[PDB]
Design a protein around this ligand. Structure first.
Ligand SMILES: CCCCCCCCCCCCCCCCCC(=O)OC[C@H](COP(=O)(O)OCCN)OC(=O)CCCCCCCCCCCCCCCCC
Ligand SMILES: CCCCCCCCCCCCCCCCCC(=O)OC[C@H](COP(=O)(O)OCCN)OC(=O)CCCCCCCCCCCCCCCCC
Ligand SMILES: CCCCCCCCCCCC(=O)OC[C@H](COP(=O)(O)OCC[N+](C)(C)C)OC(=O)CCCCCCCCCCC
Ligand SMILES: CCCCCCCCCCCC(=O)OC[C@H](COP(=O)(O)OCC[N+](C)(C)C)OC(=O)CCCCCCCCCCC
Ligand SMILES: CCCCCCCCCCCC(=O)OC[C@H](COP(=O)(O)OCC[N+](C)(C)C)OC(=O)CCCCCCCCCCC
Ligand code: SF4
Ligand code: SF4
Ligand code: SF4
Lengths: 48, 240, 192, 321, 115, 69, 112, 181, 126, 136
C-alpha cells in the first residue's frame, strides 16, 4: 500500500528441513562388483 | 510446473487508520516485581549478618553487601537449592569519585536452574582489597583481571592478576574518571633508534568538548511509584 | 500450591525423555559387518563428497568483472561526502553547525560568520575523511540537505593529505555528483 | 553480528527509557536478528572448517553472505556497519520490495545448507578432527560462564531467546538443539541446526510482518520525519535538540542480555539522568570463552588447538572491546 | 586452569615486617635474571647497569608509612617482574626503559616559552 | 554464461576489433545494446542474453586500451 | 584519604608538580533561566601558559599538548570534591559560588 | 512444513529442455538449486526505481490531533522510582505487616509504632523476637517453604521431539531438538 | 561412624549432560544425605535462624518424596529440580553450606553497616 | 600481487569478501600469503593499537623488497572512530610508509579493489632499470 508488506495470502512455504537422500547401490552390491572385477581381472592376467 | 509468481504484483492488504494501545511499559513487570521482592527479602532474612540492603528494579534484583560479606553471600547464592546461581556472567566496576569508596564492584549471577538472574553490589576504595570469587567461579579469572587493568582494584585471592587489555607497562587505570580519554602518551616510529618509541601526547586537533552545552533544565521528573502494595508500611488510620 | 515445598520450580523440571537410553553395544548395530567395511574400505561418503563438488563445476559462477561491472547499490548508500546547492546556485548550508555536533567521530570542523551581503554562511568547512566513520549522521541532521554522501567509493588517494576535504573540495564534489545525488534523493525521499 | 550488537544496546537503553518499540519495529529487529545470525554462522562455521582444511565450503557460503549483506545495505546504506537498530526502534522503514527479496533468497537458501552439510557433516576426516576434541562438561561450562552454543553442546538446554524473550522472539515458533557430548562435533551440529531454525523464523517474519511505525511515536526520543520537520514548528525544535543535545535517560542502571550468535552478550549501562551514559560495560561472549581455553586445551595437540579456537567463535573485537 | 610461569598468589599482607622480607627477596630475583634480561632483550649495555637501575626504583618508595599503600606497591611490584621474565614486553619497551636521558635559567625558559 | 557457445555468439556479434579489446581489458567477450556515452567517452551497454547471471547484465567499454580507471 | 593515593594511580608526576586544578560549581548562564547545571560541583584544570592551543598550519585545526583540556569531573557534594582532590595530592584552589540575595517580588508593587 | 520442494518452485535459474533431463539423470538430489538468482525476478525493479509512494505510518492514539495529550503517553517520565529496602524497612514491614495486610494500631497509638521503625532496626534482632507464624506467613512461603528464585519466563518449558517432527538429524546423531510444549 | 557415599560417578551410562554419569544407587544415597542434613542442621544452627527453618522445610519434603517413590521418574517430577544424579549434588552442597553457614554465624547483627554516603547515586538515596 | 594477511578488525571482513566468489581477487592473480617472505604487499586492515604497533613494524621489516603498503579503512588511515583513545595509533603511517590510502568504514570490496588497481597502475609506471641508464 504505502509500506513494504507481505501479500494478502502470504508467501508459499519454503524448504528448511534437512534434504540429503542417500544415493548408490547397497553396500553388498559394491562388494560383489569389486570381487567380480578382481576375478575378471586375474582371468585376463592369467590368460596373457 | 506452473510458472513462478511475480511477488511484486500479488495483491497486498489494505488498511485504513492504524490503532495501537498506549500503556506504560513498566506495568508488564508487575508480577516480576513482587516475586523478586519476596525472594530478595528471603536472602536478607537468611543472612542478616551480610546483606546490607536489597533493591528491585523492574526484573532485576540487587543485593548490596560489604567487601567482607562477598564470599559468604556468593557461596550462599551458589549452593542454596532455592537459589542455585552456578554461573557468574559479569564482574565489573564503576567509578564514583564523590563517594568515599569510589569503585562499585558489581557481580551478575545466572541460575540456569530456575531461570533467574541476581546482582551483587559491593564497594571498594583505591587501596582497600576485595575478595576474589575465582575459588567459587572460575569464569571470574579474566573479569577480575580486566577490572584491575581498568580500575586498579586490589583483588585478594586471585591466582594470577595482571594486565589483560592495556599494553605492558601501561601507567594508570583507564576507566577511572580522572584519567583523560586520550591518555597521556602516544607512539611513533623513530628513525634514529630504529624502533617504535613512546612520546608525550600531542593532538593535531585537540578534542572538542561539546558536552558543556548540556540541558540547563531537568529533563525527567521524579518518577512513578510501582512498589507492590504488599511492601509498603501501612498508614495508621485516624481514630474516631 | 506451588513446588516451593520441595524447592523446585516448573523451570527446573526436565521434559519427558530427557534421560538418555542405554548406549548400543557392538551387537546392536543394524549394519552387517561387511556393509560397514565396504563403506569403510571404499570411502563411501568421500566419493559422494567429490561428486557434489563436481556438480558445481558445471554451474554458472558468481564472479563479476569489476571495474567493468559494479555490485548493486541502493539510494541509501553512504559514500563520499558532498556539499550541495540550490537550483538558484546559492550554497545550501546555512552554517547551522548541527552536523558538527552529531558527528560521532568529530570529523567536521565548521567556522562561520555573516557573509559580505548579510547571509549566514560558512567560510571554513572541513571533513577529516580519515576520521569519518561513514555513518550518515551528518546527512540525517542537516535541515536543508546541504551535506550528503554520494554513492562514490572509488576515491582512494596516494597521500593522506588528499583525504582532508576542505570546503572547496566538498563543493566541487557536490557539483560533480549532483545528478547522482538526485537519483538517490528522489528514490529515498519518502522513507526519511 | 553487527545488528545484534546494536540490538542489545537498544534494549538496554529502551529499558532505562521505560519505552517499548512498536509492533512493526520488533518484527524488523527479529527479521534482521536472524539474518545477522545466519551471517555470523556462515562466517564462523565456514571459517572454522577452513582452518581444519575444507577450503571450498567457505567459498560457497560467502556468496550467501554477499546476498545477505545486500539486505543490510538496502535498508541502512552500509554493508557492514549499519547503524540501523537504535534505541527506540530502527533508523528507517524497509524499502519497497525488500520482503520479496528476503523470500526469494529464503526459498533457495535451504539447498545451500545441504551442500555445506554434504562436505562436512558425514565426512570421516571432519569427524576425526572434531569428535572427542574440546570436550566440556556441564559443570565446567556453568562455572566458566560458557554461553550460547558452548553450553548447549554440553547438554544444558538454555537459550536467552526463551529465558527473556525480546523483540518479537515470543511471537514466532522455533526449536533449539542441545548437544550431549560437549565436543566440537556437537557444537558443529547445533550451529547447523541454528541455521535451519533461523530460516524458519525468517519465513515467519516475512509472513507476519505488520504495518505501522517502526520507531517510538515519541519525538522526544526519536527524530521526526523530514517532511514534518520542515513544516511543523515543534518537529523542528525536537529535531534540533535530538541531534545536538541528545535525549536524557532517567537515572539508574541495567543489565540487558540477548542471545547473540556467539553466545550471551550483555551490557551494563549506568545512567545519571544526563544525555550520556555514565558507564557501559560490555560482556562479550568470546571474552568468557577465551578464559576457558586453558581449561579445555589441556591435553591436546597443536592441530587440536586450531579446532578449539574455531569452535569458540573468537572475533577479537568483542574480546578486546 | 593453571597459572603461568613465575606467577604468585595475590595476598594482602597485614604486617609491615612480613612485607620487607618479600620486598628484599624479590630484589635478588630481579638481580639474578639481570644477565638473562640483557641476553633475551639484546640490550646494548652490560648487565652491570641493569643491576644498577633496578636498585634505584626500590628506594623510590622506601619511606611509605601507611600499610594499604605498601601492599599495592608490592602487588604491582611482582607484576612488573613477572612480565619481564616471561619475555612478554617487546625489545622496544625495555630499551626505552633504560634509554631515559640541570634546569634552564629563568631567562632561558622565558626565552623559549617556558611551561 | 560460461559455455563456449556464449563466447562464440558474442564474438561474432561484436566483430574482431571490438572483441579483441574485450579480450584485452574485459577478459570476457560480451555483446550488448548500446545505451549511451558519457562526457569522458565511455560507452555503456546492456546485455539481453537470457543466460547472463544476475549482476552481469550491464557493463562499460572504457576509452583507453591498456588501462582502465 | 590520608594516604598518598597518587602513588598507585600511575598518573604522570606533572599533575602534582606542574598543574593546578580548580574545584568550582558552575555558574548560572545569563542567556537561559534554568538552574540545574549549577547544582553539581566540578573539577577542571587550568590551561597552560603556552601550548594550550595553537593553529595547525595545514588545515587550521586547534592543536594542543594539554592532555587535561577535555577532562571535567562531576560531584554531588562539595566535600567529596575536596576529599578526592586531597587524596590525589592535587594543588587545587576552591572557587566559592556566589549566592543570590533574596528579594520578595509582588505584583501590586508596580503601583505601590 | 520444511519438506523438500521441487526445483522449479525456487527462485533460481534452472535448465530447460534436453539439459534438464541430463541434469536430473546425473545429480545426486535433483531438487537442488544452482543458487544463481532469477534475472527476471530478483531485484528487477531496483530499490531506486520502485513504484510505491511511501507514507509515514501513524497509529491513532499517539498520532492523532485529538484525544492525544502528551502527558497521557509520556512514559519516559513515568519510570519506576528506585527504592532500596534496608534491614530497617524489612523489620518494619515484618513487624507491622504491609499496607495491604495491616498489623498496626490506629490513630496516635499507631503513629507511635510506625515511628519505632523510622530509625535503625537491625533485622537480626527482629527475627529472634517475633511470632514463628510471622516467618511462615511473611518471610517464608506456603507454610515455611523457602522462596525459590523467581523465573524470568514462566512459559519457558521444553519437550523432546523426534526426527519425524523436527526434520533435523536422526536419532543416531548426538544432539536432540527441544520444542516448546 | 564411617558412612562413605558416592556423589558423582566417574563411569557408567550417560544422563544427557556431559560429565554427569548415571548413579548406581540413586535412592538410598539421597535418603542418607537428607537424614544427615536434618540431623547435622540442629547440631550447629539455632532455631531462631530462618535458614534452618528453610532447609528443614524442603529437606524434609525431599526426604518424604524419595521414600514413597521407588520409580526414579516419579521422584524427579515431584521434587522438580532435575535428574536424580543432580539431586545428589544439591543435597551434598546443601550439606556443605551448613558447615560454612554455622561458621559464619550468619544469623547475627550486620557486621559492617554502609557509610551514610555509600548507596547514594548522583545525590539521591537509593 | 600477493598481499600479506594482516587483517586486524572489521576491515578484514571486507578483505575476505574481495576473495569471495563475487569479486574473486584470485582471478587477477592476487593470492593472500601468510608470511612476509612470500608477500610483497602489506594491507593494514583494522585498528593499529599501541600494543600491536611494535609487532607491525617488525612484520614490515621482514618483507623483502620491493614492497608496498596499503592502508585500508579509517582506523589504519587516521585513527577513525578511535582517534581520541588512549590505546590507538592515530594513523599507521606513523609506523610504516604507506603507498596508498583506501577510505571508508569499512571500504567496500570494490573500494578496496580500486585501491589495489590504483597501486598496480603505479607499479607499472615504475622505471627501476631505466633510472640506472639515465638518472644514474
Ligand atoms: C571357478 C573358477 C573357474 C575358472 C575358469 C576356467 C576357464 O574358464 O578356463 C578358461 C581358461 C582355460 O580353459 P581352456 O584350456 O582354454 O579350455 C577351453 C575353454 N573354452 O582358463 C585360463 O586360461 C585362466 C583362467 C583363470 C581363472 C582365474 C579365476 C579368478 C581368479 C581368482 C578370483 C578371486 C576373486 C576373489
Ligand atoms: C585386489 C585384492 C582383492 C580385493 C578383493 C578382496 C576380497 C576378499 C575379501 C576378504 C573377506 C571376504 C569374505 C567376506 C565375508 C566373510 C565376512 C563375514 O561374513 O562377516 C563377518 C562375520 C560376522 O557376520 P556379521 O556380518 O557381523 O553378521 C551381522 C548380522 N547383523 O564373521 C563370521 O562370523 C565368520 C567370518 C568368515 C570366516 C572366514 C573368514
Ligand atoms: C564404479 C566406479 C566409480 C565409483 C568408485 C567408488 C564407489 C563408491 C561407492 C561404494 C562404497 C559404498 O559403501 O557404497 C555404498 C554407498 C552407501 O550406501 P548407503 O549409504 O548404505 O545407501 C543407502 C541405502 N540405499 C542403498 C537404499 C540407497 O553408496 C554410495 O555412497 C554411492 C556413492 C556414489 C557417488 C560416488 C561415485 C562417483 C565418484 C566419481 C566417479 C568418476
Ligand atoms: C579389502 C579391500 C581393500 C581396499 C583398500 C582401500 C582402503 C582405503 C582406505 C580405507 C580405510 C579408511 O578410510 O580408514 C579411515 C582412516 C582411519 O580411520 P580410523 O582411525 O581407523 O577410524 C575409522 C574407523 N573405525 C571407526 C572403525 C575405527 O582415515 C581416513 O579417514 C583416511 C581417509 C583418506 C582419504 C584420502 C583421499 C582419497 C583419494 C582417493 C580417491 C580420489
Ligand atoms: C625470459 C622471459 C621471457 C619473456 C617473458 C614474458 C613477459 C610478459 C610480457 C609483458 C607484457 C606487458 O607488460 O604488456 C603490457 C605493457 C604495459 O602497458 P602499460 O603499462 O599500459 O604501458 C604501455 C602502453 N603505453 C606506453 C602506450 C601506455 O606494455 C604494453 O602495453 C606493450 C605495448 C606494445 C606491445 C608490442 C609487442 C610486440 C610483439 C611481441 C611479441 C611478438
Ligand atoms: S558520516 Fe558520521 S562520522 Fe562521517 S562526517 Fe557524517 S556524522 Fe561524522
Ligand atoms: S547540518 Fe547542514 S546546514 Fe547545518 S552546518 Fe551541517 S551542512 Fe550546514
Ligand atoms: S575503519 Fe571502521 S571497519 Fe575498518 S577496522 Fe576501523 S572501525 Fe572497523
Amino acid at each position: 500500500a504505502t509500506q513494504d508488506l507481505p501479500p494478502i495470502s502470504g508467501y508459499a512455504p519454503i524448504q528448511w528441513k534437512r534434504n540429503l537422500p542417500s544415493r548408490g547401490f547397497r553396500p553388498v552390491i559394491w562388494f560383489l562388483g569389486l570381487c567380480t572385477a578382481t576375478g575378471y581381472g586375474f582371468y585376463q592376467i592369467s590368460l596373457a | 510446473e506452473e510458472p513462478l509468481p511475480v511477488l511484486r504484483d500479488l495483491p497486498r492488504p489494505e488498511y485504513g487508520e492504524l490503532h495501537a494501545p498506549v500503556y506504560n511499559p513498566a506495568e508488564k513487570y508487575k508480577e516480576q516485581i513482587e516475586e523478586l521482592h519476596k525472594f530478595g527479602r528471603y536472602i536478607m532474612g537468611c543472612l542478616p549478618k551480610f546483606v546490607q540492603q536489597f533493591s528491585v528494579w523492574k526484573d532485576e534484583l540487587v543485593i548490596y553487601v560489604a567487601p567482607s560479606a562477598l564470599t559468604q553471600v556468593a557461596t550462599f547464592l551458589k549452593d542454596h537449592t532455592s537459589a542455585q546461581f552456578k554461573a557468574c556472567m559479569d564482574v565489573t566496576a564503576a567509578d564514583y569519585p564523590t563517594r568515599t569508596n569510589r569503585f562499585d564492584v558489581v557481580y551478575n549471577l545466572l541460575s540456569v536452574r530456575h531461570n533467574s538472574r541476581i546482582r551483587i553490589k559491593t564497594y571498594a576504595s583505591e587501596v582497600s582489597p576485595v575478595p576474589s570469587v575465582v575459588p567459587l567461579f572460575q569464569g571470574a579469572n579474566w573479569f577480575e583481571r580486566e577490572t584491575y587493568d581498568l580500575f586498579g582494584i586490589f583483588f585478594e585471592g586471585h591466582p594470577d592478576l595482571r594486565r589483560i587489555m592495556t599494553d605492558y607497562g601501561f601507567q594508570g587505570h583507564p576507566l577511572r574518571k580522572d584519567f583523560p580519554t586520550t591518555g597521556y602518551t602516544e607512539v611513533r616510529y623513530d628513525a634514529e633508534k630504529r624502533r617504535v618509541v613512546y612520546e608525550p601526547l600531542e593532538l593535531t586537533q585537540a578534542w572538542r568538548n561539546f558536552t558543556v552545552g548540556s540541558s540547563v533544565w531537568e529533563q525527567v521528573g521524579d518518577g512513578k511509584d510501582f512498589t507492590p502494595e504488599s511492601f509498603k508500611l501501612p498508614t495508621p488510620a485516624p481514630d474516631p | 500450591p506451588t513446588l516451593a515445598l520441595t524447592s523446585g520450580s516448573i523451570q527446573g523440571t526436565h521434559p519427558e525423555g530427557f534421560r538418555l537410553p542405554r548406549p548400543k553395544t557392538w551387537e546392536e548395530s543394524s549394519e552387517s559387518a561387511l556393509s560397514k567395511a565396504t563403506k569403510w574400505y571404499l570411502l563411501s561418503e568421500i566419493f559422494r563428497g567429490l561428486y557434489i563438488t563436481l556438480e558445481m563445476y558445471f554451474r554458472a559462477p558468481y564472479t563479476i568483472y569489476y571495474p567493468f561491472e559494479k555490485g548493486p547499490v541502493s539510494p541509501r548508500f553512504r559514500g563520499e561526502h558532498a556539499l550541495r546547492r540550490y537550483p538558484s546556485g546559492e550554497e545550501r548550508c546555512i552554517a547551522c553547525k548541527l552536523c558538527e555536533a552529531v558527528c560521532p567521530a568529530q570529523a567536521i570542523t565548521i567556522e562561520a560568520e555573516e557573509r559580505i551581503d548579510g547571509s549566514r554562511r560558512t567560510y571554513k568547512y572541513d571533513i577529516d575523511m580519515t576520521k569519518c566513520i561513514y555513518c550518515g549522521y551528518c546527512q540525517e541532521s542537516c535541515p536543508v540537505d546541504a551535506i550528503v554522501e554520494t554513492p562514490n567509493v572509488e576515491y582512494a588517494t596516494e597521500t593522506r593529505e588528499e583525504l582532508l576535504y576542505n570546503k572547496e573540495k566538498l563543493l566541487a564534489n557536490g557539483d560533480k555528483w549532483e545528478q547522482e545525488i538526485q537519483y538517490a534523493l528522489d528514490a529515498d525521499a519518502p522513507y526519511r | 553480528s553487527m545488528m545484534t550488537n546494536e540490538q542489545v544496546f537498544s534494549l538496554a537503553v529502551e529499558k532505562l527509557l521505560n519505552l517499548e518499540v512498536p509492533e512493526r519495529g520488533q518484527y524488523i529487529r527479529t527479521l534482521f536478528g536472524e539474518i545477522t545470525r545466519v551471517l555470523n554462522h556462515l562466517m564462523s562455521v565456514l571459517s572454522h572448517a577452513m582452518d581444519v582444511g575444507a577450503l571450498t565450503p567457505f567459498l560457497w557460503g560467502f556468496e550467501e553472505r554477499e546476498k545477505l549483506m545486500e539486505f543490510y545495505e538496502r535498508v541502512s546504506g552500509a554493508r557492514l556497519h549499519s547503524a540501523y537498530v537504535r534505541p527506540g526502534g530502527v533508523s528507517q522503514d524497509l524499502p519497497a520490495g525488500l520482503l520479496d527479496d528476503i523470500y526469494m533468497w529464503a526459498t533457495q537458501f535451504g539447498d545451500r545448507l545441504d551442500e555445506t552439510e554434504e562436505l562436512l557433516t558425514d565426512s570421516r576426516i571432519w569427524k576425526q578432527r572434531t569428535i572427542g576434541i574440546g570436550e566440556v562438561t556441564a559443570e565446567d561450562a556453568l562455572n566458566y560462564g560458557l554461553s550460547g552454543v558452548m553450553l548447549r553442546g554440553s547438554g544444558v538446554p538454555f537459550d536467552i531467546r526463551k529465558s527473556q524473550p525480546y523483540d518479537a522472539y515470543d511471537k514466532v515458533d522455533f526449536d533449539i538443539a542441545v548437544g550431549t557430548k560437549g565436543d566440537c562435533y556437537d557444537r558443529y551440529l547445533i550451529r547447523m541446526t541454528e541455521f535451519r531454525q533461523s530460516l524458519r523464523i525468517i519465513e515467519q517474519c516475512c509472513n507476519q510482518m505488520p504495518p505501522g511505525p517502526v520507531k517510538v511515536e515519541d519525538f522526544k526520543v526519536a527524530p521526526p520525519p523530514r517532511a514534518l520537520m520542515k513544516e511543523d514548528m515543534e518537529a523542528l525544535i525536537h529535531h534540533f535538540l535530538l541531534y545536538t543535545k541528545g535525549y536524557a535517560v532517567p537515572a539508574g542502571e541495567t543489565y540487558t542480555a540477548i542471545e547473540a550468535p556467539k553466545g550471551e552478550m550483555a551490557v551494563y549501562v549506568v545512567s545519571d539522568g544526563s544525555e550520556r551514559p555514565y558507564r557501559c560495560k560490555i560482556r562479550a561472549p568470546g571474552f568468557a570463552h577465551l578464559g576457558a581455553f586453558d581449561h579445555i586445551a589441556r591435553g591436546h595437540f597443536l592441530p587440536d588447538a586450531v579446532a578449539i579456537i574455531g569452535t569458540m567463535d573468537l572475533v577479537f573485537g568483542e574480546v578486546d572491546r | 586452569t593453571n597459572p603461568t610461569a613465575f606467577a604468585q598468589t595475590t595476598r594482602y599482607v597485614k604486617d609491615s615486617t612480613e612485607m620487607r622480607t618479600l620486598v628484599l627477596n624479590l630484589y635478588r630475583r630481579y638481580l639474578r635474571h639481570s644477565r638473562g634480561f640483557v641476553n633475551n632483550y639484546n640490550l646494548d649495555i652490560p648487565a652491570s647497569q641493569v643491576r644498577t637501575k633496578i636498585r634505584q626504583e626500590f628506594e623510590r618508595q622506601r619511606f611509605v608509612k601507611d600499610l594499604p599503600l605498601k601492599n599495592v606497591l608490592y602487588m604491582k611490584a611482582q607484576m612488573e617482574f613477572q612480565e619481564l621474565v616471561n619475555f612478554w614486553k617487546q625489545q622496544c619497551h625495555v630499551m626505552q626503559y633504560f634509554e631515559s636521558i640541570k634546569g634552564d635559567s629563568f631567562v632561558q625558559k622565558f626565552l623559549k616559552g617556558a611551561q | 554464461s560460461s559455455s563456449i557457445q556464449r563466447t562464440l555468439r558474442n564474438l561474432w556479434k561484436n566483430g574482431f576489433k571490438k572483441s579483441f579489446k574485450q579480450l584485452q581489458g574485459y577478459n570476457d567477450i560480451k555483446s550488448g545494446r548500446l545505451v549511451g556515452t558519457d562526457s569522458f567517452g565511455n560507452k555503456f551497454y546492456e546485455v539481453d542474453d537470457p543466460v547472463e547471471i544476475h549482476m552481469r547484465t550491464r557493463f562499460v567499454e572504457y576509452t583507453g586500451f591498456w588501462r582502465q580507471d | 584519604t590520608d594516604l598518598a593515593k597518587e602513588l598507585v594511580s600511575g598518573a604522570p608526576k606533572e599533575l602534582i608538580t606542574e598543574r593546578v586544578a580548580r574545584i568550582y560549581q558552575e555558574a548560572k548562564a545569563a542567556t537561559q533561566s534554568g538552574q540545574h547545571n549549577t547544582e553539581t560541583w566540578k573539577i577542571d584544570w587550568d590551561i597552560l601558559n603556552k601550548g594550550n592551543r595553537w593553529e595547525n598550519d595545514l588545515m587550521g585545526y586547534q592543536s594542543s599538548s594539554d592532555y587535561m583540556q577535555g577532562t571535567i569531573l562531576k560531584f554531588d557534594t562539595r566535600e567529596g570534591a575536596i576529599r578526592f582532590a586531597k587524596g590525589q595530592g592535587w594543588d587545587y584552589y576552591i572557587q566559592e559560588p556566589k549566592v543570590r540575595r533574596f528579594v520578595k517580588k509582588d505584583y501590586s508593587a508596580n503601583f505601590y | 512444513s520444511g519438506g523438500p520442494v521441487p526445483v522449479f518452485k525456487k527462485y533460481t535459474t534452472g535448465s530447460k529442455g534436453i539439459w534438464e533431463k541430463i541434469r536430473q539423470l546425473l545429480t545426486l538430489v535433483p531438487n537442488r538449486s544452482t543458487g544463481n538468482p532469477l534475472v527476471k525476478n530478483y531485484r528487477v525493479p531496483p530499490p531506486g526505481s520502485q513504484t510505491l509512494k511511501y507514507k509515514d505510518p501513524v497509529t491513532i492514539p499517539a498520532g492523532d490531533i485529538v484525544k492525544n495529550q502528551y502527558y497521557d503517553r509520556d512514559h519516559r517520565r513515568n519510570y519506576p522510582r528506585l527504592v532500596a529496602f534496608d534491614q530497617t524497612k524489612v523489620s518494619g514491614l515484618l513487624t507491622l505487616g504491609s499496607a495491604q495486610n495491616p498489623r498496626i494500631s490506629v490513630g496516635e497509638k499507631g503513629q507511635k509504632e510506625l515511628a519505632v521503625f523510622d530509625q535503625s532496626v537491625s533485622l537480626s534482632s527482629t527475627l529472634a523476637t517475633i511470632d514463628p507464624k510471622v516467618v511462615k506467613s511473611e518471610l517464608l512461603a506456603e507454610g515455611g517453604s523457602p522462596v525459590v528464585a523467581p523465573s524470568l519466563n514462566k512459559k519457558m518449558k521444553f519437550r523432546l521431539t523426534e526426527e519425524s517432527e523436527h526434520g533435523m538429524y536422526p536419532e543416531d546423531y548426538p544432539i536432540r531438538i527441544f520444542a516448546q510444549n | 561412624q564411617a558412612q562413605e557415599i558416592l556423589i558423582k560417578a566417574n563411569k557408567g551410562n550417560p544422563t544427557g549432560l556431559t560429565g554427569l554419569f548415571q548413579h548406581p544407587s540413586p535412592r538410598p544415597t539421597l535418603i542418607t544425605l537428607y537424614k544427615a542434613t536434618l540431623k547435622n542442621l540442629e547440631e550447629k544452627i539455632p532455631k531462631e535462624s530462618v535458614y534452618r527453618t528453610a532447609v528443614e522445610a524442603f529437606t524434609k519434603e525431599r526426604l518424604s518424596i524419595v521414600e514413597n517413590n521407588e520409580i526414579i521418574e516419579d521422584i524427579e517430577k515431584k521434587i522438580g529440580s532435575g535428574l536424580v544424579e543432580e539431586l545428589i549434588v544439591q543435597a551434598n552442597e546443601e550439606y556443605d553450606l551448613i558447615d560454612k553457614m554455622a561458621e559464619w554465624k550468619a544469623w547475627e547483627e550486620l557486621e559492617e553497616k554502609p557509610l551514610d554516603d555509600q548507596w547514594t547515586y548522583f545525590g539521591k538515596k537509593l | 600481487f600477493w598481499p600479506m594477511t594482516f587483517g586486524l578488525a572489521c576491515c578484514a571482513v571486507e578483505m575476505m569478501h574481495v576473495s569471495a566468489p563475487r569479486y574473486d581477487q584470485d582471478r587477477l592473480g592476487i593470492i593472500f600469503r601468510a608470511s612476509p617472505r612470500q608477500s610483497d604487499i602489506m594491507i593494514v586492515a583494522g585498528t593499529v593499537t599501541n600494543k600491536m604497533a611494535p609487532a607491525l613494524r617488525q612484520v614490515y621489516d621482514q618483507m623483502p623488497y620491493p614492497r608496498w603498503v596499503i592502508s585500508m579503512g579509517s582506523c589504519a588511515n587516521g585513527g577513525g572512530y578511535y582517534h581520541y583513545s588512549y590505546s590507538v595509533v592515530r594513523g599507521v603511517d606513523r609506523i610504516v610508509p604507506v603507498d596508498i590510502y583506501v577510505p571508508g568504514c569499512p571500504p567496500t570490496s570494490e573500494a578496496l579493489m580500486y585501491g589495489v588497481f590504483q597501486l598496480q597502475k603505479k607499479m607499472m609506471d615504475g622505471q627501476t632499470h631505466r633510472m640506472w641508464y639515465r638518472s644514474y
